[PDB]
Structures are given as C-alpha cells and as structure tokens.
Amino acid sequence: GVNLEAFSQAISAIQALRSSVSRVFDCLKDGMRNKETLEGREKAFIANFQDNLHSVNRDLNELERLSNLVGKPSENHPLHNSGLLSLDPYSQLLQAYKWSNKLQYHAGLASGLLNQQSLKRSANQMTTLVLPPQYVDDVISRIDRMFPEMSIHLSRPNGTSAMLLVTLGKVLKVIVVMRSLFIDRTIVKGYNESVYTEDGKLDIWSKSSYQVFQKVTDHATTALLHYQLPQMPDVVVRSFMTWLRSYIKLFQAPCQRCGKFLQDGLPPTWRDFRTLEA
C-alpha cells in the first residue's frame, strides 16, 4: 500500500534520536548562568531528558507499520540493470521519473495558487459555449459512470437538451433535465415517488415529494447555479457529482442534535452538517 510514506516520517523520528542526545549534552555543556528566580533550570535538563522518551515512541511507531508486502520484489525497477554492458553508458529516465512527479507536484501547488485568479475581464477579447456535438453528453455520462457504486442512466426523450437520472444506495434518485453542456433545473424525490422510468407513460416530471427532499432539491439547484464556471463543463458536472455523493450516508448530525427538523443537509463546503444554520 501507500503506508511506505509513513516510514519517511520515521526517518525524521530517528533524526531526533540523534539530535535529542546532542541537545542533552549541549545542556550539560554549561551550568547555571544566572537562575536568580528558581532551580527549574536543572529540571530543564530533565526536560530535555523527557524528549528522549520520544525515541521509545519510535519503536511504538512500528506497531502501526508493516501492513503487508507486495509480490514481485524490486518492483520491476532494476530490470534495466539486467541488461548487458551495452545498456550501461540509463539512470536518466529514473531521474525524470522523479522530475515528472515534481512537475505534477509543482502544478499541484501552481494550479492551487491559480485559484486566486486575476482575470479583470472575460469578454470583448474574442464563442459557442453550448457544445455543438451530441456526443459530449455521452462522454460526460461515461465519465460519471466511471465512478463506482453510483449508477447513472439517461434517455433524453424531450429532444436536443439533456435528460438523465441517477440512483444511490437509498431510493432518493435525482432527475436532472438540463441544457446541452451544464447542469440546471434538476429535482429529487424518494421511494418511487417519482418513478421516472415509466411514470404514467414516460419519464414524467411531477414536480413533487412529501416535503422532505424539497430542501435538498433547492440546495442542489443553488449549487448548480453557483458552480457554473465560465469554461470546462466536465469539471462542473464532476463537481456536481461529487457534491451529490456527499448524501450517501445521512447519518451524522454535528453542531446540533438530530431533532432540529425533518433532516439536515447543506454541504457546499465539502462537509455536511445541521441545516437551517448557514
């Protein structure tokens, strides 16, 4: 697994294991300059001694470590070394192996700091923001279905615009009827109250529920109207899907008791809590 990175911290740990004892003897390198207030200075010595206990903690750190070992030792890395002398002038690639990573890592910061944009204007510098091809919808559908344990379906019986339905662990399916590219004008229900497979005769609208999911529907509409980025509609629908995923539990109830109202949910901050409080 990825627990190997934990060993990195362990490295720093044993580093202190050295420094600690140095900080001990350095503290013994000189005596009382001028206490004049108390004799805790000597205790200060023992204070450094206390940090030596940290070393024992290092031994404890190995209890959580050693999850399991992976097969095929050496992880296909030194296979290039098995080549003849002709292959040895190849380490460069391995360097790039880190470099590329750094690249990503650099972007990992850069893109992050790209969040604070400076686009004083976005028009009068040019188009067709509505996606022409009726194939990018299927692309977005497949990208969403790439997510596990969350099934998505779509029929689009109305026309050019997009129509889709999504289901989760509960029967709280969500019907989203939006334009070509970005999600807008959706609704949610629960327990066959919509039944948008063959409701009456087709995927009906019915604009209703028993006064429980209505707040969730309004919040999802707000999230759709708020996450409408100027570009990258795929990012928009992915953010929408991630937001929708946050209701798969409906179990916790922080910053209040589980008796304030019918339910509780408003996670635009990537964390749900008691509703009617933000």
């Binding site: 005596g31 001028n34 004049e36």
Partner: protein, 240 residues
C-alpha cells in the same frame, strides 16, 4: 619547597635540582636512581594533579603539535621554548610529578587512549628534544620528523592569558565612561559565570573565594597583587 620530608645529606629540592645529570629516557629508572621514599607528604594531596597540575601536562602536549610550525607566517609561531635551562626545569617538574603519580593514581594522564603510560613516551620525546637543544643544538634532527607524529591524545582550547592595550598612537582617543570601543588556573573557568569571580587583568582570570577546603596554599599565596597584579578587577555576570 612544599615537601615535609625527612632530612638527608642535602635539601630535597636541592638534591632534586641535580636531576640534569641523568639518562635520556625511562624516568622510572632515574627517579629510583636518585630517591623514591622521602617524597610523600600526606594523604590530602589529591587536589592538585587532577585539578591544576594537568595544565603542565597539556602544556608539554601543546609543544609537540606546535613543534613543526616553522613554516607558519610567524617565526616563533605561538612559542619556541628553546632555552633548555627552563626546559630542564620543566623536565624536573615532569619527573617529580611522575613520582607523584607513582605515589597516587589521581595524576594527569593523556585522557584519550594508549594507557596500557603515555606520559613516559611524552617525557622521553621531551628529553630527546632537550638533549638535542641543550648546548647550542639544532632545530627545525631526523628525530624531529618522528616526534612530529600527532598521537591521538592532544587536547586543545587553553587559556594563554592576555589582555588588550591602549594603542593611541599620535592623534586622538575619545571614549565614554562605559561601553568601551574596540581598539591561578585551579579550574574556576566554566562557560557562563557561576560566582562573583574576582579576576585580574594580567593573566589571572580566577575565582574570588577559590571554592576549596585545604588548597589555601595558592589562594593565600595570591590574595594580594599577583604577577604585576595591580589590575585585580571585578565585574558581575550578565543578566538576560
């Protein structure tokens, strides 16, 4: 003359002075060759060797490493000490502290390694350079190359007492009342101050009460003005 020994043909210090007429190496031989018994004074002598006498030991060590430094940008470098007479006096000091350590195990060894008696080899190299420089000798013999070897025993960071001066050459020296502008070895010298530490300007840098029980010899011997000791000053410790 600090020996309460038993009398003999001549004085103890006087008879010790003639040690010059002795072989080069193996001080352990010459010590019993002159006299061994009448040199102990009392049990309460275990305060000088491990505390203050160690200096002289380190002293001779500081000579060795400083021996091959003629090419340095200083003709005598740190020091030269090629007098011989004073060197003979120091060699007598070495043999008497050797018989002292023979009388008590709390002497000043090399403190580092090769104890199974570095002092013996140190002393023999010193006597070698002595006899090589006693009566108008050479300086840098082939022996110089071999004694120049750095044994893993030499310590560093010695005081080498000194003081500033007044280099007011010709024109002007303006100072304030305070905040000067730039331009006894019985231990008693830690990193930070630990007592009143009444010091002096010549070389002393010592403590005020000497913090001892029966070492009053040195303390009483230096309560008054020390070597040009008009500069017996005092200053408190710093506070944060």
């Amino acid at each position: 003359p600090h020996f309460l020994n038993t009398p003999d043909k001549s004085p103890g210090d006087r008879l010790a002075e003639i040690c010059a007429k002795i072989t080069d190496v193996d001080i352990d031989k010459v010590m019993i060759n002159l006299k061994t018994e009448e040199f102990v004074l009392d049990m309460n002598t275990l305060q000088a060797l491990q505390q203050l006498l160690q200096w002289v030991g380190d002293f001779v060590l500081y000579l060795l490493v400083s021996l091959p430094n003629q090419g340095s940008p200083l003709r005598p470098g740190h020091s030269f000490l090629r007098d011989g007479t004073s060197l003979g006096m120091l060699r007598e000091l070495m043999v008497v502290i050797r018989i002292w350590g023979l009388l008590k195990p709390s002497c000043l060894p090399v403190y580092t390694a090769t104890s199974d008696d570095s002092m013996s080899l140190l002393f023999r190299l010193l006597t070698k350079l002595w006899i090589c420089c006693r009566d108008e000798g050479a300086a840098s013999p082939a022996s110089d190359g071999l004694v120049s070897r750095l044994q893993p025993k030499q310590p560093l960071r010695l005081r080498f007492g000194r003081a500033p001066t007044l280099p007011s050459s010709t024109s002007t020296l303006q100072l304030d009342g305070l905040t000067r502008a730039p331009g006894l070895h019985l231990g008693a010298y830690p990193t930070e101050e630990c007592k009143a530490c009444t010091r002096c300007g010549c070389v002393t840098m010592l403590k005020s009460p000497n913090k001892t029980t029966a070492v009053t010899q040195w303390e009483q011997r230096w309560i008054k003005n020390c070597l040009c000791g008009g500069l017996w000053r005092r200053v408190p410790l710093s506070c944060s």
